[PDB]
Design a protein around this ligand. Sequence first.
Ligand SMILES: [Mg+2]
Ligand SMILES: [Mg+2]
Ligand SMILES: [Mg+2]
Ligand SMILES: [Mg+2]
Ligand SMILES: [Mg+2]
Ligand SMILES: [Mg+2]
Ligand SMILES: [Mg+2]
Ligand SMILES: [Mg+2]
Ligand SMILES: [Mg+2]
Ligand SMILES: [Mg+2]
Ligand SMILES: [Mg+2]
Ligand SMILES: [Mg+2]
Ligand SMILES: [Mg+2]
Ligand SMILES: [Mg+2]
Ligand SMILES: [Mg+2]
Ligand SMILES: [Mg+2]
Ligand SMILES: [Mg+2]
Ligand SMILES: [Mg+2]
Ligand SMILES: [Mg+2]
Ligand SMILES: [Mg+2]
Ligand SMILES: [Mg+2]
Ligand SMILES: [Mg+2]
Ligand SMILES: [Mg+2]
Ligand SMILES: [Mg+2]
Ligand SMILES: [Mg+2]
Ligand SMILES: [Mg+2]
Ligand SMILES: [Mg+2]
Ligand SMILES: [Mg+2]
Ligand SMILES: [Mg+2]
Ligand SMILES: [Mg+2]
Ligand SMILES: [Mg+2]
Ligand SMILES: [Mg+2]
Ligand SMILES: [Mg+2]
Ligand SMILES: [Mg+2]
Ligand SMILES: [Mg+2]
Ligand SMILES: [Mg+2]
Ligand SMILES: [Mg+2]
Ligand SMILES: [Mg+2]
Ligand SMILES: [Mg+2]
Ligand SMILES: [Mg+2]
Lengths: 93, 47, 66, 57, 110
Amino acid sequence: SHYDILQAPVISEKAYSAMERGVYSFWVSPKATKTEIKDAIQQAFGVRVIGISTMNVPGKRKRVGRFIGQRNDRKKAIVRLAEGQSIEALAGQ
Amino acid sequence: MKRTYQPNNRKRAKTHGFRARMKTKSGRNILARRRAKGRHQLTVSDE
Amino acid sequence: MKPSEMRNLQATDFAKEIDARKKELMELRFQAAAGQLAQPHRVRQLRREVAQLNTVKAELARKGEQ
Amino acid sequence: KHPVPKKKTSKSKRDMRRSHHALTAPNLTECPQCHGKKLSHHICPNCGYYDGRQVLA
Amino acid sequence: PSAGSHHNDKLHFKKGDTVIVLSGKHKGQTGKVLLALPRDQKVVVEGVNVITKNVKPSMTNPQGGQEQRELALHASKVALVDPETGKATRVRKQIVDGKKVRVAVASGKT
RNA sequence: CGAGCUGGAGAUACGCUUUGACUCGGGGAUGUCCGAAUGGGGAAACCCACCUCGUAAGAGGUAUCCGCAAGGAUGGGAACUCAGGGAACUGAAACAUCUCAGUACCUGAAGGAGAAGAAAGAGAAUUCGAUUCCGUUAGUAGCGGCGAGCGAACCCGGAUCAGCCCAAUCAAGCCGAAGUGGCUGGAAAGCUACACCUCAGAAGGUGAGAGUCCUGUAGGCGAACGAGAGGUCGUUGUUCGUGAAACGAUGACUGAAUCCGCGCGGACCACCGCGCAAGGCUAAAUACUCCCAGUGACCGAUAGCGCAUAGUACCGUGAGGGAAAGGUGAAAAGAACCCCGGGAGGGGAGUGAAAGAGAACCUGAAACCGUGGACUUACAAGCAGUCAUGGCACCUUAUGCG
RNA sequence: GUAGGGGAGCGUUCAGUCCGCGGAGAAGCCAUACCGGAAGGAGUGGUGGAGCCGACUGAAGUGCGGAUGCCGGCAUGAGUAACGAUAAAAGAAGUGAGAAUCUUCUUCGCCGUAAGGACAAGGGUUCCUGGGGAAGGGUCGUCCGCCCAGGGAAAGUCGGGACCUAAGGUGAGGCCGAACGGCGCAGCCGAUGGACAGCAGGUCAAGAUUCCUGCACCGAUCAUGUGGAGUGAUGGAGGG
Ligand SMILES: [Mg+2]
Ligand SMILES: [Mg+2]
Ligand SMILES: [Mg+2]
Ligand SMILES: [Mg+2]
Ligand SMILES: [Mg+2]
Ligand SMILES: [Mg+2]
Ligand SMILES: [Mg+2]
Ligand SMILES: [Mg+2]
Ligand SMILES: [Mg+2]
Ligand SMILES: [Mg+2]
Ligand SMILES: [Mg+2]
Ligand SMILES: [Mg+2]
Ligand SMILES: [Mg+2]
Ligand SMILES: [Mg+2]
Ligand SMILES: [Mg+2]
Ligand SMILES: [Mg+2]
Ligand SMILES: [Mg+2]
Ligand SMILES: [Mg+2]
Ligand SMILES: [Mg+2]
Ligand SMILES: [Mg+2]
Ligand SMILES: [Mg+2]
Ligand SMILES: [Mg+2]
Ligand SMILES: [Mg+2]
Ligand SMILES: [Mg+2]
Ligand SMILES: [Mg+2]
Ligand SMILES: [Mg+2]
Ligand SMILES: [Mg+2]
Ligand SMILES: [Mg+2]
Ligand SMILES: [Mg+2]
Ligand SMILES: [Mg+2]
Ligand SMILES: [Mg+2]
Ligand SMILES: [Mg+2]
Ligand SMILES: [Mg+2]
Ligand SMILES: [Mg+2]
Ligand SMILES: [Mg+2]
Ligand SMILES: [Mg+2]
Ligand SMILES: [Mg+2]
Ligand SMILES: [Mg+2]
Ligand SMILES: [Mg+2]
Ligand SMILES: [Mg+2]
């Protein structure tokens, strides 16, 4: 359902700085429509979104011993809200 | 000098592709024959 | 709990129990991805519960139409 | 064209040839100061002495 | 080609049982079953006992450090004991209650 | 089943389990996207829609062909089966008929088999009685540039038996006999002294070789669910190559009798015999072996499958081709700690029966590279040996035949 | 005594049977002056660490120097040729276990319709940061396009799609053909073309007509007003 769509938050110098300007960044399910993501974030956080952007991200191909393989392809979503609305569980961070 | 192999995604797919191979009995016969050999690479679209 | 606790309740209560479980699983995903996730097991456990729920409401909905 | 050897060269031959590859060990002198060793007419690489003291430490 | 394959992944004794060591260097010493692994057929008995080394790792502690811990054994050097005989003893399956299966010798039971 | 479990994975953490986990057996629920793909498109696994319900979330439907409907079909399957189509090399010591051979290959349809089948027959006894398969007849009768070479059938003996209708017990599992002491050894199964069970001495595991230590075997028990017409031309089939060519089989043209009638019996006629075409189904014996189990004067790492697993790496645009690979130890007790070095590597120590097993770990031959020692070689012409003698050296089948 | 014929045997695996050895140590490997008419065979010693000899009998994947034979390992040529454009280097300084090769500074030299910059095709994480140094780098490396980890890519307006048609590919119906199949009108797929709304700046270590700032634009749906009778397709024409 809703909660299924949001795999994880993005953790990195970039993303923190973004939330410090009130802009948050989530690892999403690769098939997700932007509207689906928008709605999902709203329900999960009771926050009105004014802007989204997304990006499909090919997973790094790495090797373990003789075994060459690919990590899961992902999708990154960046959202910016109105009203300087924040999200607590990820703001203190 | 210009060499034989000159990469082209659409070429390769349209020529050695799964849809291509399925479009004909002889290509179907490749598909089956390959499956049988246990190839990881059934067909070019597997790359 | 797997058998008892589920069947006794309404199919409109299932939707709710499901939803809440989903939500907890996501919380645990954020935590885990940020660290540490002190209790991994809970994840899997919650997973199971979800399954049970959907199994039950399936079973029941087809046993009430027997 | 393209000369090539007619016959494998014996281990014996090959080694007779090598009778001249002996390295020549340095003639080595002991520095009149800091005392390790040096090459004649070079700076003693331990201290740095060549009568007073040229290279650094 | 696993060790349990020959012994049908079956343990001829339970965990917590006392056991006499049949074969080897520790002939006859006795102990409580601290750990028993069916598929591998390996069992721990407070008597075998070795000195293991913890090498580099700064956990536990920067320096090395040695250690005294028992090293598991192959099922086939283990037996249930008989309080009377006190010795290496076979087992018969007989009945009690109330649906319980139990274990006797030539004079039940453990 | 009854105490462990948390996959190969051996790794830390979290934890589950006698309210019965894990594993085994048996059914169900869920089952994304592609692939016959089937809503439409498409460079497989992705892009775009429409309809009904629904609060949205979501759910379901939207291909073509047979049919009124119900329902059926499409795709896949190593070999085996039948059918439509159908090679050449090669053999004829050249070649064309012939042969390879109705083999290879291609396509089709189908099953666990399939085909075939219920005499207008085979045949010569006025005998036999659906078909297939095995033996045999038999390399016989025949065929044949009568060359190469090709090659039946009847009888007889077996395997399995069948002939009916239409058109006027096995799949989880449980129970299950009998030994101890001393000796060698790191370690007991081996030795040794007495001892026992056997409807059970098949086999594997246990520190070396165990009937009586473990798993088992003989034997017994065992489930709610589970499973059992004629003709003419052109041709061809069987031994059937135009032969005197019957008979079946159709492509073309043409086309009769229905019981005193019809079809055959190797041109053709009479006679004498066997037969009821043009309407359908049919199990069984037979074939095969992807899969499963048992066995082996089969293989044990260049062998055996290509693989101790991989159709991988690698090569190729593609079709397609395609490897090498094995071993510490009984047990990780996988070497704390010290020394040189950035490390690599090593020397100690410790473990071990053995590190003369240390992870570039069973044995570890030969080529090939080196260190050390013996006797030797700087006036010498050589397939490097062989014979004879002298010198030095050496003394475990050795003071002589060395 | 060559082709060839004949005769008696040696050795190898596997198999049956008999004998029998083996941790006080098997097979295999290694040395050797002994034995036999030869294939060959024993004695002792060193190695090794778990199986095996002798005898009779049976069956073979049964004996190698050749085949420009096959797989594999290692020699020779040899410390030889070469180190891949003759655009060119020098010093200081730093680092570091180690520097001609890495970093900084100062110069020098070479390209400059290029040897500079930006797209496409192709490649696929090679980008940025921090670390590493076995191999890869034709030397060396402390460095790297290599190895490890973590980050990084943001679009109503750029390109593609939810629009269009070309060649071509398809294609119900329909036309042919032993089979598989070959054609084929409309329709449909098909960019290399038609169509189409956003510019100027700023800045991550790594993105920018995407993010941030500044001010525009486009269609769509609704509300308030201007409404106050037309809307104009799957066909026509203009146009493109
Ligand atoms: Mg985007
Ligand atoms: Mg990498
Ligand atoms: Mg169990
Ligand atoms: Mg589709
Ligand atoms: Mg010919
Ligand atoms: Mg010929
Ligand atoms: Mg088929
Ligand atoms: Mg004719
Ligand atoms: Mg004919
Ligand atoms: Mg006829
Ligand atoms: Mg070997
Ligand atoms: Mg070391
Ligand atoms: Mg010497
Ligand atoms: Mg002279
Ligand atoms: Mg001389
Ligand atoms: Mg003679
Ligand atoms: Mg024998
Ligand atoms: Mg042998
Ligand atoms: Mg040779
Ligand atoms: Mg040559
Ligand atoms: Mg070679
Ligand atoms: Mg030189
Ligand atoms: Mg030379
Ligand atoms: Mg030279
Ligand atoms: Mg040179
Ligand atoms: Mg160069
Ligand atoms: Mg130069
Ligand atoms: Mg320094
Ligand atoms: Mg340079
Ligand atoms: Mg400076
Ligand atoms: Mg340029
Ligand atoms: Mg990309
Ligand atoms: Mg180098
Ligand atoms: Mg460093
Ligand atoms: Mg870089
Ligand atoms: Mg904007
Ligand atoms: Mg066409
Ligand atoms: Mg274009
Ligand atoms: Mg535009
Ligand atoms: Mg566009």
